Structure formats: C-alpha cells, structure tokens
Amino acid sequence: YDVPDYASLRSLVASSGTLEFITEGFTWTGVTQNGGSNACKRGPGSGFFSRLNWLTKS
Amino acid sequence: GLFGAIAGFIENGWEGMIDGWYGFRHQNSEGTGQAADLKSTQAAIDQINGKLNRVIEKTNEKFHQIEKEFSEVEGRIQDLEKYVEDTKIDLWSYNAELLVALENQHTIDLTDSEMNKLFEKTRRQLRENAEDMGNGCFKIYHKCDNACIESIRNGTYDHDVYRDEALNNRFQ
Amino acid sequence: GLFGAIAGFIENGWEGMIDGWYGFRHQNSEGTGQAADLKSTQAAIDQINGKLNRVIEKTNEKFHQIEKEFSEVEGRIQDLEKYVEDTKIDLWSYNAELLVALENQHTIDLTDSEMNKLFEKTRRQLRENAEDMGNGCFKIYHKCDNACIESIRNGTYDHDVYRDEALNNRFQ
Amino acid sequence: GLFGAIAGFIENGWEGMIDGWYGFRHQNSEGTGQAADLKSTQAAIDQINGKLNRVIEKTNEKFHQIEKEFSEVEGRIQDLEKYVEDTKIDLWSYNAELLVALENQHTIDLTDSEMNKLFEKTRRQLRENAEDMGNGCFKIYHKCDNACIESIRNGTYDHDVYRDEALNNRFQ
Ligand SMILES: *[C@@H]1O[C@H](CO)[C@@H](O)[C@H](O)[C@H]1NC(C)=O
Ligand SMILES: *[C@@H]1O[C@H](CO)[C@@H](O)[C@H](O)[C@H]1NC(C)=O
Numbered sequence: 001y002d003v004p005d006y007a008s009l010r011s012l013v014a015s016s017g018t019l020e021f022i023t024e025g026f027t028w029t030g031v032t033q034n035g036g037s038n039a040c041k042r043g044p045g046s047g048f049f050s051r052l053n054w055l056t057k058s
Numbered sequence: 059g060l061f062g063a064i065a066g067f068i069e070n071g072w073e074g075m076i077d078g079w080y081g082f083r084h085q086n087s088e089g090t091g092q093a094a095d096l097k098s099t100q101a102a103i104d105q106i107n108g109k110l111n112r113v114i115e116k117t118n119e120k121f122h123q124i125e126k127e128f129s130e131v132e133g134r135i136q137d138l139e140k141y142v143e144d145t146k147i148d149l150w151s152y153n154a155e156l157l158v159a160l161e162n163q164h165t166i167d168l169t170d171s172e173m174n175k176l177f178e179k180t181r182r183q184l185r186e187n188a189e190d191m192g193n194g195c196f197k198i199y200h201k202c203d204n205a206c207i208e209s210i211r212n213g214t215y216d217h218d219v220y221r222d223e224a225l226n227n228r229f230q
Numbered sequence: 231g232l233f234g235a236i237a238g239f240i241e242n243g244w245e246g247m248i249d250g251w252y253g254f255r256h257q258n259s260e261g262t263g264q265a266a267d268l269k270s271t272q273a274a275i276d277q278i279n280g281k282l283n284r285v286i287e288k289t290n291e292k293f294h295q296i297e298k299e300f301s302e303v304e305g306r307i308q309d310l311e312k313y314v315e316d317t318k319i320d321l322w323s324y325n326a327e328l329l330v331a332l333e334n335q336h337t338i339d340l341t342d343s344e345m346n347k348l349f350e351k352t353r354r355q356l357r358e359n360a361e362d363m364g365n366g367c368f369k370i371y372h373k374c375d376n377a378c379i380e381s382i383r384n385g386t387y388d389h390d391v392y393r394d395e396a397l398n399n400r401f402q
Numbered sequence: 403g404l405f406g407a408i409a410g411f412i413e414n415g416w417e418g419m420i421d422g423w424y425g426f427r428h429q430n431s432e433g434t435g436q437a438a439d440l441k442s443t444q445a446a447i448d449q450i451n452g453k454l455n456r457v458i459e460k461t462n463e464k465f466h467q468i469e470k471e472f473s474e475v476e477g478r479i480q481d482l483e484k485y486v487e488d489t490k491i492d493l494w495s496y497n498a499e500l501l502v503a504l505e506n507q508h509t510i511d512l513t514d515s516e517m518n519k520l521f522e523k524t525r526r527q528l529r530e531n532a533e534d535m536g537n538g539c540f541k542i543y544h545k546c547d548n549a550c551i552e553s554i555r556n557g558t559y560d561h562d563v564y565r566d567e568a569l570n571n572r573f574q
C-alpha cells in the first residue's frame with residue numbers, strides 16, 4: 001500500500017490514542033465483498049486488511 | 059538585603075514616616091523630632107521609576123499572524139502551527155518570570171543599598187563626635203540642638219567645632 | 231565577591247569548620263575555642279535552598295509534538311520543522327546558560343554578603359572595646375572569658391560594663 | 403553605584419590618572435605625589451575582560467535555513483515561515499537588550515565595589531593612626547614620609563610603631 005500524506009495520518013491516529021473500531025453496516029449492492037490476495041496471507045489462505053473491504057465486480 | 063541595613067541592623071520601619079522613604083528621628087534636650095531625607099528618597103525613586111521601560115521598551119505591533127485556533131484536524135501543518143505557538147508562549151513566559159524575579163531582587167538590593175549609603179554618609183559627617191550604637195542610631199556626644207541636627211541632615215555638619223567637647227565626653 | 235569578605239580580608243577558609251558555614255574562632259587566657267554561627271548559616275542556606283524553583287517552577291508537560299527526525303527529504307515543510315526545532319533548542323540553551331551564570335554570580339555575592347554582614351554585626355556589638363585588626367579578626371581590649379565570648383556570639387554582649395577597662399587598655 | 407564610592411563619597415575622578423584605574427594621591431611635608439594601585443585595577447580589568455564570552459560562548463554555525471524573503475503570496479506556509487522568523491527575531495532582540503542591561507549594571511556595581519574595597523583595605527591598614535575625612539581621603543596623624551606612604555600603598559604599613567604619636571596627635 002501507500003499513504004499519501006502518511007505523516008499526517010500517522011500523527012492524527014497517534015494523537016487520537018486509540019484503535020477502537022466500530023463496524024458499521026455498509027450496503028454494497030451488486031458487488032462482491034471481502035476480496036483478498038495471496039500477498040496478504042491471513043491463516044492458510046488469501047486475505048486482506050481486516051479493516052478494509054475489497055469490492056470487486058459481481 | 060545584601061547590605062543588612064533594611065531588615066538588618068535597622069530592625070524596624072517607621073509607619074509614621076509619610077514624608078519620604080528614608081529619614082531621621084532625632085532626640086535631644088529640646089525634644090524628639092522627625093524629618094525625611096529627600097536626596098536618598100529621590101535617588102531610590104528615580105532608579106525605580108523606570109526599570110521596565112529599559113528592557114521591554116514598549117509593545118511591538120503585530121497585525122497579521124498565523125491561525126492559533128483550529129476546528130478540524132489537518133495533520134502536519136496544524137501540528138507545526140500549534141508547536142510554534144506553544145514554543146513562543148513558553149519562551150515568553152519564562153522571559154517574564156525571570157525578568158520579574160531579577161528586577162525584584164535588584165530593587166530590594168537597591169533600596170537596601172540606599173539605606174546603607176545614607177547611614178554611611180551620616181556616619182562620615184560625624185567623624186569622632188558620635189558613636190554608632192548598632193541599631194542604626196547614632197549617639198552624639200555633645201550639646202546638639204535643632205540647628206545642629208538640621209546641619210547634620212543638611213550635610214554641612216561642622217565636626218571641627220564640637221571635636222573637643224565630644225572627645226572629652228567619650229573618653230573622659 | 232562584591233564585598234571583599236570572602237577571598238578578601240578573611241583570606242582563608244576553615245576546613246576544620248564542619249558545624250556550619252560561618253563561625254567564630256576565639257582565643258583568650260583560658261584557651262582557643264571554635265564555634266559556628268547558626269543564624270548566618272541558616273540565612274544563607276535558606277536563600278540558596280530554592281533559587282531554581284523560583285524561576286523554572288517545574289517541568290511543563292508536553293505530549294504530542296512535531297516530528298523531529300526525518301527519513302526522506304520533502305522540502306519546505308521539513309525545512310520549516312527543522313528550523314523551528316533548531317530555533318527552540320538554541321533559545322532554550324541560551325536561557326540555560328544565562329540563568330546558570332546569573333544564579334552563580336548571585337550565590338557568590340550572597341555568601342560574601344552574609345560573611346560581611348556577620349562581620350559588621352560583630353563589630354557593632356563591640357562598640358569601642360575592640361579593634362578590627364584587618365584580617366577579619368577582632369582584638370578585644372579586656373579580660374574576656376568564655377562567658378564573654380559566648381555573649382558576643384549570642385548577640386547579648388554588654389559593651390557598657392567593659393568600656394572603661396577597654397578604653398584604658400587602648401589609649402593608655 | 404551600590405556602594406556609593408564612585409559618584410558617591412569620592413565625588414570626582416582623576417583625569418590625570420593614566421597609570422591605572424584606581425590609585426592614591428598623597429600629600430605630606432616632602433610634597434604631593436601620585437601613584438596607581440595595580441592590584442585593584444588588575445582585578446577589575448580581569449573581571450571585565452570577558453563578561454560576554456561567559457554567556458554567549460561564540461557564534462553558532464548555521465548553514466541551510468528557511469526562506470525569509472518571498473516574492474509571491476502563497477498563504478499558510480509563507481505565513482508560518484514569516485511568523486517563525488519574526489518570533490525568533492523578537493526573542494533574540496529581547497535577549498540582547500536584557501543581557502546588555504544586566505552586564506552594564508553589574509559592571510558599574512563591580513567597579514564601584516572595587517573602589518570601596520580599596521578604600522576599606524586602606525582604612526584597615528591605618529587602624530588608629532588615621533581618620534577618614536569623608537571625601538574619600540585619609541588624614542594621617544603623624545610624620546609619614548614617602549617611605550611611609552609607599553608602605554601604605556604596598557600593604558605592609560606597620561601601624562604599631564606610629565600608634566603612640568598618632569594617638570597623641572588625635573586625642574591630645
Ligand atoms: C472493538 O470494540 C468494539 C466496540 O467497543 C466492539 O464492537 C468490537 O467487537 C471490538 N473488537 C475487538 C477485536 O475487540
Ligand atoms: C542647608 O544648607 C544650605 C546650603 O548648604 C543652606 O542654604 C540652607 O540654609 C541650610 N538649611 C536649611 C535648608 O534648612
């Protein structure tokens with residue numbers, strides 16, 4: 001990955017002082033969710049970032 | 059209080075003194091009298107009257123500056139602005155604290171020195187005619203009427219014409 | 231050393247003095263004795279005990295600041311951050327240097343003044359009974375036993391009852 | 403002028419003095435003579451010779467900094483750079499003003515103290531043989547030839563061998 005303005009995001013996340021993540025109900029209609037790749041191996045199989053949803057065509 | 063005059067060997071202020079800052083209380087045959095020394099009071103007041111204009115001349119004039127209050131959270135640039143303002147505030151607060159402490163210390167030493175200088179000047183006028191009793195008060199060893207006392211306060215005390223009588227009174 | 235007492239007319243410290251900072255060494259018919267003056271030592275220690283809490287009250291509390299170490303080279307913003315930090319460091323280093331120099335100078339002047347104040351207080355107790363030999367040591371001109379000496383150190387020296395004998399010894 | 407020696411009880415400088423800063427003018431039967439005191443002059447000069455290297459050790463070395471002059475108008479970043487530079491300039495200007503004021507005050511007090519210290523040292527050499535006339539000038543009460551005077555200036559004045567004659571001249 002790559003973070004444009006990486007310093008700013010790191011700074012504000014550090015200042016917030018928490019990684020508390022509240023899952024919201026997003027409704028992605030007509031696309032495949034939970035995309036993954038073999039570069040990011042979660043468990044034995046392919047995976048992805050746990051806080052990001054890779055939407056592909058359905 | 060570097061010289062030990064004020065809060066030292068004087069040991070007490072005079073709330074009845076309203077004429078000036080430093081002065082004399084004399085007691086002789088005629089009766090007790092009190093006066094203030096204008097020269098020492100004026101010197102101390104002159105040295106105190108400024109004392110803050112001589113370092114911080116005045117207020118400099120600032121018109122357009124950075125923003126110091128922010129609504130959202132941007133990141134690097136807001137962090138830098140907050141840091142710059144906090145650094146400036148801390149440095150100027152330290153400057154204020156140190157300046158006030160130094161000025162207060164010097165003012166106290168200055169007034170103590172003026173008291174000591176008045177005492178020494180008076181002691182030097184009374185070369186051998188008087189003895190310092192140690193509580194900041196001189197014992198003069200001859201008939202010294204109000205004209206004599208006002209000559210002491212004036213600075214024109216003629217020590218030569220009382221030297222014989224004073225020396226006879228002291229050493230018998 | 232503004233008053234010339236310490237490293238001035240005293241000319242020597244007393245490594246055998248462990249009781250206090252300032253004190254007396256007396257020598258009379260009975261024999262040499264030594265004591266320390268608690269009042270002057272306590273005054274100097276009290277004036278020294280703080281002396282840094284009165285300007286820099288304490289450490290202020292800083293939590294989130296700018297970045298001060300950088301991996302890559304960005305340009306304007308990194309230059310500004312480096313400049314701000316370098317400016318703050320230089321200003322605080324100067325503050326530290328000047329503060330320490332001023333405090334050291336005042337401490338030295340303060341201890342010198344306390345020594346001079348003790349000397350002058352003692353000299354004023356011995357109005358005409360003693361003569362200052364100039365090396366910081368008084369020659370008393372009468373039988374002065376250990377009770378006499380401890381009265382001098384106490385501050386209750388009764389100069390009136392030795393005045394005749396002392397004056398006779400001095401001026402013959 | 404905390405001690406009132408210079409511009410105080412001395413009341414006048416000596417433009418004819420080129421040998422040193424502090425010195426003596428003696429007058430006896432042989433004739434008027436003048437000399438300079440090397441020890442006090444050297445002490446004052448030594449204390450003055452630095453006095454600025456002891457706070458600002460030297461010039462620090464700055465190579466690449468921010469831009470301080472701008473052609474166009476950008477906005478936030480230019481405002482921040484201008485603000486940072488103006489803050490640094492104001493803080494350093496205040497540092498310069500306060501430092502120079504403090505150093506000047508201490509230099510004046512230092513030279514006054516050296517004058518007072520020389521006066522007191524001389525007065526302590528002449529234990530009972532001389533009287534302070536109050537204008538910073540001692541009246542010695544015995545035959546004191548040029549060898550006597552140079553012994554006073556030397557610091558080896560033998561007060562014991564003139565004590566009887568001096569006391570007889572003073573108190574008759
Ligand atoms: C994190 O916290 C949120 C709410 O506090 C909760 O819903 C979620 O299950 C938590 N997840 C983990 C891994 O603790
Ligand atoms: C004080 O002295 C001045 C000059 O030395 C003289 O003119 C005056 O009469 C004296 N007495 C006062 C001011 O009471």
Ligand SMILES: *[C@@H]1O[C@H](CO)[C@@H](O)[C@H](O)[C@H]1NC(C)=O
Pocket residue numbers: 380384386
């Ligand atoms: C010292 O003086 C105090 C009061 O002036 C007195 O009580 C004491 O007995 C004296 N002698 C000492 C403390 O040795």
Ligand SMILES: *[C@@H]1O[C@H](CO)[C@@H](O)[C@H](O)[C@H]1NC(C)=O
Pocket residue numbers: 552556558
């Ligand atoms: C001054 O004193 C020193 C030592 O005390 C002596 O050697 C010298 O001869 C004296 N006279 C001078 C330097 O004229």
